[PDB]
Amino acid sequence: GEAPNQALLRILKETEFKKIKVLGSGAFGTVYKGLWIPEGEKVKIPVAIKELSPKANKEILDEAYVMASVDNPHVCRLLGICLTSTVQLIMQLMPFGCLLDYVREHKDNIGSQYLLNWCVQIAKGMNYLEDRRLVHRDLAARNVLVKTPQHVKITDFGRAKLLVPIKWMALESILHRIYTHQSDVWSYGVTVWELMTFGSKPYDGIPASEISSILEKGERLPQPPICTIDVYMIMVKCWMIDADSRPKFRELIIEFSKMARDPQRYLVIQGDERMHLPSPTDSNFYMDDVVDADEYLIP
Numbered sequence: 142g143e144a145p146n147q148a149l150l151r152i153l154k155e156t157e158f159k160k161i162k163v164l165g166s167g168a169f170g171t172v173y174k175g176l177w178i179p180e181g182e183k184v185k186i187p188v189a190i191k192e193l194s195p196k197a198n199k200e201i202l203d204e205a206y207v208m209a210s211v212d213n214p215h216v217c218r219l220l221g222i223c224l225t226s227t228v229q230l231i232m233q234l235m236p237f238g239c240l241l242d243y244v245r246e247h248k249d250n251i252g253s254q255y256l257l258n259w260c261v262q263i264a265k266g267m268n269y270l271e272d273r274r275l276v277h278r279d280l281a282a283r284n285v286l287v288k289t290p291q292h293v294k295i296t297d298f299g300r301a302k303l304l305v306p307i308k309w310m311a312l313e314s315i316l317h318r319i320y321t322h323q324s325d326v327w328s329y330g331v332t333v334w335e336l337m338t339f340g341s342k343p344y345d346g347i348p349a350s351e352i353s354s355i356l357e358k359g360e361r362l363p364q365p366p367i368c369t370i371d372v373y374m375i376m377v378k379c380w381m382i383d384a385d386s387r388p389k390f391r392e393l394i395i396e397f398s399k400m401a402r403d404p405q406r407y408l409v410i411q412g413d414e415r416m417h418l419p420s421p422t423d424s425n426f427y428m429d430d431v432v433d434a435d436e437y438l439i440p
C-alpha cells in the first residue's frame with residue numbers, strides 16, 4: 142500500500158560533537174550551537190543540538206523519525222541522534238535563526254526580491270512535504286529557518302503526520318481537527334502575511350477562542366501596506382472555506398516565481414533595490430575544515 146521508508150537513522154557518539162552556546166530554550170529543553178567533528182573525516186560541521194519522562198522521549202523520537210525521513214533543499218533534515226542520559230537531535234545550524242525574527246530585525250534592508258523568493262522557497266518545501274504525503278500542521282514564520290538571507294528552510298516536525306496554533310490553522314482544523322495539505326496551504330497564507338507585515342502578530346489582541354467565530358463571519362487578516370492586490374488575492378485564496386478551492390503548493394510556486402521575476406510590480410517598498418543583506422560573497426560572512434551540512438553526504 143505505502144512504500145517502505147528506507148531512511149537511515151544515524152546514531153552519533155557524544156564525543157564527536159561539542160556544544161558552544163545556547164541558541165534557544167523552552168519547555169521542550171534547550172538548543173545549542175555546536176560543531177560535529179565525525180570519525181577521522183577532517184571536517185567540522187556547524188550544528189544545532191536539541192537536548193531534551195518517557196512520554197517526552199517518545200515525542201522527540203516521533204519528530205526524529207519524520208525529520209530523518211525528509212531530503213529537500215527547502216526542508217531541514219535530521220543529521221543524527223545521540224543516545225545519552227538525555228536524547229539529543231543533531232540538526233543543521235541555520236545561522237540567521239528563524240525568519241520571523243529575521244523580518245522583524247532586518248526590516249529596513251528587506252526588499253521585494255527577498256520576500257517573493259522566500260515565498261517561492263517555502264512553497265517548494267511544502268510541495269516536497271506534500272509529495273512525501275506529510276502534513277506539517279505547524280507551518281508559521283517561526284518554523285521557517287534562515288541558512289543564509291537568500292536560503293530558507295521549513296522545520297519543526299513536532300506536529301507532522303502522514304496522509305495548538307489556532308491563528309495559523311484552517312477553519313476545518315479548529316472546528317473538526319481535519320488536517321490535509323490544503324489546511325497547510327491556509328497556514329502558508331498566514332506565514333506569507335507574517336513576512337509581508339515584517340513579522341506582525343496575526344489577529345493581535347484577539348483571544349484564540351474568538352478566532353473560529355471571526356473566521357466563520359468572513360473576517361480575514363488585513364491587506365499588508367506593501368502588498369499589491371495581486372499578492373493579497375493569493376493570501377485570500379489560501380483562506381477560502383472550501384479546502385479544494387485554495388491554491389495548491391505547486392501553483393503557489395508558479396505564481397510567486399512569476400512575481401519574483403518583476404518584484405517591484407508586486408510589492409511596493411520604500412528604497413527597494415538599494416537595500417543590502419549579507420551574502421557568501423561578503424567579508425567575514427562565514428574555521429579550518431568547516432563544511433556545511435548540505436555538502437557533507439553519507440558516512
Ligand SMILES: CO[C@H]1CCN(c2nccc(Nc3cc4c(cn3)nc([C@@H](C)O)n4[C@@H](C)C(F)(F)F)n2)C[C@H]1F
Pocket residue numbers: 164165166169172189191217218230232233234235236237238239242286296297298
Ligand atoms: C522546538 O525545537 C525546534 C528548534 C528549531 N529546529 C531546528 N531544525 C533544524 C535546524 C535548526 N537549527 C537552528 C535553530 C536555531 C538557530 C540556528 N539553527 N538559531 C536559533 C535562535 C537564535 O533563533 N534557533 C532556534 C529556532 C532554536 F534555538 F529554537 F532552535 N533548528 C526544529 C526543532 F528542533
